[PDB]
Amino acid sequence: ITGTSTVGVGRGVLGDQKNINTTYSTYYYLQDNTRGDGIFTYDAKYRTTLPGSLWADADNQFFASYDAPAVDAHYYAGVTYDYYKNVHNRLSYDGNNAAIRSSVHYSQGYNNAFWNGSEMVYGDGDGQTFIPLSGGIDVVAHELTHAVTDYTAGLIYQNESGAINEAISDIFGTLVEFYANKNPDWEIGEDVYTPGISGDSLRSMSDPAKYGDPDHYSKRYTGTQDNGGVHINSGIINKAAYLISQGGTHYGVSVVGIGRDKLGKIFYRALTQYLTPTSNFSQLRAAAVQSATDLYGSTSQEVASVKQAFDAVGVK
Ligand SMILES: [Ca+2]
Ligand SMILES: [Ca+2]
Ligand SMILES: [Ca+2]
Ligand SMILES: [Ca+2]
Ligand SMILES: [Zn+2]
């Protein structure tokens, strides 16, 4: 829409109050003109037709419970755009400020959220397994990172390359959660998963086996479900990335942590300059080692820690 940029106020899924960038033109729309070519939030009104209608509101105040998922989809897309811009100097997901669009209230009782190749889509959850998925900043950033991957390495969504694609989304989803300093941790989806149980999450990067995912290459899933285990075998890479950052001893192999910041620079470089659509775990290890080498020198502690971490999860 063409109109005047302004700032509205609302409440997210978890009840927190936040300011959001809106546009006025008769109605106030969830359209943020301050980031790239814009961030646009749509109402899919419980249908599966996309994108739905750009979200329009009469008084620029978004405190209705129907508003909550839109508030957080719109706000957390902005935080994720800021992370990529300020930390990695990348303007939006294509690197040229593409507009970011999201639809919320997709379908009924839909327990998932996803990047479809053109925009983000968020279910409201069934209220038992999940609450509206845009309330999780790691989920939002995980999904928006698939758009970055799609425009850069182009990892296909199956077998080892799909598992890398998923882990790269958990890694940067976590880094965004730390960047916003929103009670950060190494778990995925803990703010929106099972409202009735405290302390769990969908997946864990620090201990993937707590939820039954593999934490070592010898435990990888070899069957056909989940497109060859893309959500399961991502645990092996997630554990490696947690060790590079935080350090630890895993299956008797000791890793000196180098921190989150360097973790993000190594993996962003590996993703945008050395990964290809069919890269496997062994090629990811080579890419991460070469990236660390480029940035810190072949005899740095950073290169040594990337090697130990892949050794610890059995990836040669
Ligand atoms: Ca209103
Ligand atoms: Ca958290
Ligand atoms: Ca988290
Ligand atoms: Ca829970
Ligand atoms: Zn994913």
Curated annotation (Swiss-Prot):
Binds 4 Ca(2+) ions per subunit. Binds 1 zinc ion per subunit. Its cofactor is Ca(2+); Zn(2+). Ca(2+) 4 binds at Y193, T194, I197, D200. GO terms for cellular component: extracellular region. Ca(2+) 2 binds at D138, E177, D185, E187, E190. Extracellular zinc metalloprotease. GO terms for biological process: proteolysis. It is found in: Secreted. Belongs to the peptidase M4 family. The chain holds residues 233 to 548 of 548 of the full protein. This is Thermolysin. Zn(2+) binds at H142, H146, E166. The keyword Hydrolase applies. GO terms for molecular function: metal ion binding; metalloendopeptidase activity. Ca(2+) 3 binds at E177, N183, D185, E190. It catalyses: Preferential cleavage: Xaa-|-Leu > Xaa-|-Phe. Keywords: Calcium, Hydrolase, Metal-binding, Metalloprotease, Protease, Secreted, Signal, Zinc, Zymogen. Its EC number is 3.4.24.27. Ca(2+) 1 binds at D57, D59, Q61.
